[PDB]
Design a protein around this ligand. Structure first.
Ligand SMILES: CN[C@@H]1[C@H](O[C@H]2[C@H](O[C@H]3[C@H](O)[C@@H](O)[C@H](NC(=N)N)[C@@H](O)[C@@H]3NC(=N)N)O[C@@H](C)[C@]2(O)C=O)O[C@@H](CO)[C@H](O)[C@H]1O
Ligand SMILES: [K+]
Ligand SMILES: [Mg+2]
Ligand SMILES: [Mg+2]
Ligand SMILES: [Mg+2]
Ligand SMILES: [Mg+2]
Ligand SMILES: [Mg+2]
Ligand SMILES: [Mg+2]
Ligand SMILES: [Mg+2]
Ligand SMILES: [Mg+2]
Ligand SMILES: [Mg+2]
Ligand SMILES: [Mg+2]
Ligand SMILES: [Mg+2]
Ligand SMILES: [Mg+2]
Ligand SMILES: [Mg+2]
Ligand SMILES: [Mg+2]
Ligand SMILES: [Mg+2]
Ligand SMILES: [Mg+2]
Lengths: 86, 74, 122, 117, 137
RNA sequence: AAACUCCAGUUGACACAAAAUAGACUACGAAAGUGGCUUUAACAUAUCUGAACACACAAUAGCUAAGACCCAAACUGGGAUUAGAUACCCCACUAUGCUUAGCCCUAAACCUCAACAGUUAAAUCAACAAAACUGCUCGCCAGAACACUACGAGCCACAGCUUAAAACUCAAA
């Protein structure tokens, strides 16, 4: 209201390619979290439910990071069998 | 697997037996059925690699102790 | 203690801005302050529109007043800045130079948590 | 940087209140989840909207909207081929991440050991 | 020069012109993409209403207004009323995560209008008012 | 569907309400609890332990009195669904949530894992969960149900809270 307009959340269109501008803008709002914040703000999320979701999201990250860290560590061993026949 | 060929040849060279392949459960604790009643089990097992491919002790280490066979291991 | 008065004055001329600073610095001395310096951060555009004393401001002058005063003079001076019509917004905070910065040796790596679950074959 | 786990779970040495209350033990499994099915993107919708808008003006006559129909027709042919190409190629072709069936053969060769032996 | 995605600040002088008009002068297309409707209103730089269209004003009822075809129809109806007043280039200011958030932008292009920017002004509070209680449906 | 139509959209002005991101942090406090900014005061103890009742605190809800009111919202009213619908879905609105002053004194107040000190050896260890133990002290508990009851006492509590039995009954829980 009191800030300057057409600076925040604004993307310019290159050669009339609106599709790319909308995809970029939607990638700015998803990376920042606005998209998910607006979806949880439609209906009030009680503190207890909001704390149960943060824990679920934090334990999912921890697991997904380690599983990915092991997949990148063992991808070196996805090569052909060198001792074929033994 | 890297040394499977080498060990098998030496066993043949020294007139002895080798098993560098997948250990079928029961070779030792069930030899009568698999081979026969009059089969003679090994008197000495030499483990050049005490671990399997999943970095766990070879089953023969415990299966040789059940059959009171002395084991040598690296 | 030593405080810092972040003062945002209304965009006016030199004669009126100097009369306001003097009127403001004399109010501190009357409350027992020992003014130390008067820095000017220059006149710029405000980040957002500020509404004060039935006026919508878009520009203002930024002035810092470093001073020493007793603890009881801060609350009495905050009521003096709320009545001044030439003072858009003014806040008093403890000077950041009276807060020694602890030396840092660097980032300490944290090893993954161990012995969190029993070593049993589930 | 994986988030820390010091003083998070309720234990005996930890004096403070728990930060996390996991319903499943935080121990890596020896397998990954199967990739979900994608909802998909409807194709030839813009060609399908300008072809049904011409019928209303021309009272559903196929002699005045011939050009519009071809756009909707040619698109359907191209879209149909892409669906056939995409399904077969993705599984057979190796691009980016591996598939669960091939990735679980790699995690079962290096199983997680939360026990002692 | 190159091409930046950040809008040209009014104060600092730039060279980006559209039909001889500065970015500030370009008219604005305020889209409010709700869940059950999509209202579109085109305004000038001096906040002068030029055209207004919505799914309801185009003859849709109840649950047909919350579709992507009704928003596109509303864009064509607002891009045909503003093109008679001399509007070609617009600044899109979308508000809401409704179905007709992007479909109305296509409808404005199917009326002869060229979109030069996409602005998002979706209301996000920094905790303010409390929403209605969650539902079991 | 009802409802609303001094309605809706842009712009501008405008809170005794509530405090995105940061926070992938893991801190403060006895716990309850605490996550917008600034300032003032300020966070017990140089052995440990130590109370249903002493002393002092204690989420939400609720009472009494006076204010405030954006939104939400038990009750209630309307609309619909349904065999019915005192419900789930939609709308509207109230007590209430907020402030001040008193009261009430409860919780799955549960990290269901007491306070202090210590160990990682030995028989590791019913099971599961959050590995198993030692010393010391306080508190509590001895089949299920009756029973977060009855009586008694106490309490600003008068459909209340705390403390809290037995008889009948079963051979299991
Ligand atoms: C090993 N005995 C089990 C046990 O049987 C019990 C069972 O005992 C029942 C009592 O008669 C009855 O008054 C009693 N009724 C009550 N209102 N208290 C039953 O609860 C009780 N059953 C039970 N505790 N499981 O019925 C009795 C006749 C029984 O056979 C005596 O031995 O309980 C039965 C299930 O009720 C099981 O089927 C039996 O296998
Ligand atoms: K609990
Ligand atoms: Mg659980
Ligand atoms: Mg906040
Ligand atoms: Mg004590
Ligand atoms: Mg006692
Ligand atoms: Mg009690
Ligand atoms: Mg209380
Ligand atoms: Mg109250
Ligand atoms: Mg309301
Ligand atoms: Mg009813
Ligand atoms: Mg009310
Ligand atoms: Mg609690
Ligand atoms: Mg104690
Ligand atoms: Mg009992
Ligand atoms: Mg009770
Ligand atoms: Mg009672
Ligand atoms: Mg009584």
């Amino acid at each position: 209201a009191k800030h300057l307009k057409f600076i925040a959340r604004t993307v310019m269109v290159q050669e009339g390619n609106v599709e790319s501008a909308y995809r970029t803008l939607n990638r700015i709002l998803t990376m920042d979290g606005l998209i998910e914040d607006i979806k949880h703000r439609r209906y009030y999320e009680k503190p207890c439910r909001r704390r149960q979701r943060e824990s679920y999201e934090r334990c999912r990250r921890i697991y997904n990071m380690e599983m990915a860290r092991k997949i990148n560590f063992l991808m070196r061993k996805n090569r052909a069998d060198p001792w074929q026949g033994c | 697997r890297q040394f499977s060929y080498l060990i098998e040849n030496m066993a043949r060279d020294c007139g002895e037996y080798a098993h560098t392949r997948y250990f079928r459960g029961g070779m030792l604790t069930n030899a009568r059925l698999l081979f026969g009643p009059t089969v003679r089990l090994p008197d000495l097992i030499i483990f050049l690699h005490t671990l399997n491919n999943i970095f766990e002790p070879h089953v023969a280490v415990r299966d040789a102790a059940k059959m009171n066979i002395p084991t040598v291991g690296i | 203690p030593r405080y810092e008065l972040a003062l945002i004055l209304k965009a006016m001329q030199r004669p009126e801005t100097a009369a306001t600073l003097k009127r403001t610095i004399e109010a501190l001395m009357d409350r027992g302050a020992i003014v130390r310096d008067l820095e000017n951060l220059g006149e710029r555009a405000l980040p957002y529109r500020i509404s004060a004393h039935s006026q919508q401001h878009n520009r203002g002058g930024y002035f810092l007043v470093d001073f020493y005063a007793p603890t009881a003079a801060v609350e009495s001076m905050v009521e003096h800045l709320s009545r001044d019509i030439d003072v858009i917004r003014g806040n008093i905070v403890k000077h950041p130079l009276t807060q020694e910065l602890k030396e840092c040796e660097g980032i300490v790596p944290v090893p993954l948590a161990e012995k969190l679950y029993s070593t049993k074959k589930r | 940087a994986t988030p820390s786990l010091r003083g998070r779970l309720a234990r005996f040495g930890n004096p403070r209140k728990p930060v996390l209350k996991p319903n499943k033990p935080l121990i890596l499994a020896n397998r990954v989840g199967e990739r979900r099915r994608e909802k998909g993107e409807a194709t030839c919708i813009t060609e399908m909207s300008v072809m049904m808008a011409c019928w209303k003006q021309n009272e559903f006559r196929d002699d005045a909207c011939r050009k519009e129909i071809q756009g909707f027709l040619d698109c359907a042919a191209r879209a149909q081929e892409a669906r056939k190409m995409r399904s077969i190629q993705e599984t057979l072709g190796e691009s980016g991440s591996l598939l669960p069936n091939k990735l679980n053969k790699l995690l079962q060769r290096f199983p997680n050991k939360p026990y002692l032996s | 020069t190159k091409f930046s995605i950040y809008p040209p600040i009014p104060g600092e002088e730039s060279s980006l012109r559209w039909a001889g008009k500065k970015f500030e002068e370009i008219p604005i297309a305020h889209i409010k993409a709700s869940h059950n409707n999509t209202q579109i209103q085109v305004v000038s730089a001096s906040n002068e209403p030029l055209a207004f269209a919505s799914c309801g004003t185009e003859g849709f009822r109840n649950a047909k207004k919350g579709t992507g075809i009704a928003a596109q129809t509303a864009g064509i109806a607002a891009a045909a009323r503003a093109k008679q007043k001399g509007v070609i280039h617009i600044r899109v200011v979308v508000k809401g995560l409704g179905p007709g958030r992007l479909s109305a932008m296509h409808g404005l292009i199917m009326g002869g209008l060229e979109v030069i920017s996409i602005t998002d002004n979706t209301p996000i509070p920094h905790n303010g008012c409390r929403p209605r209680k969650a539902r079991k449906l």
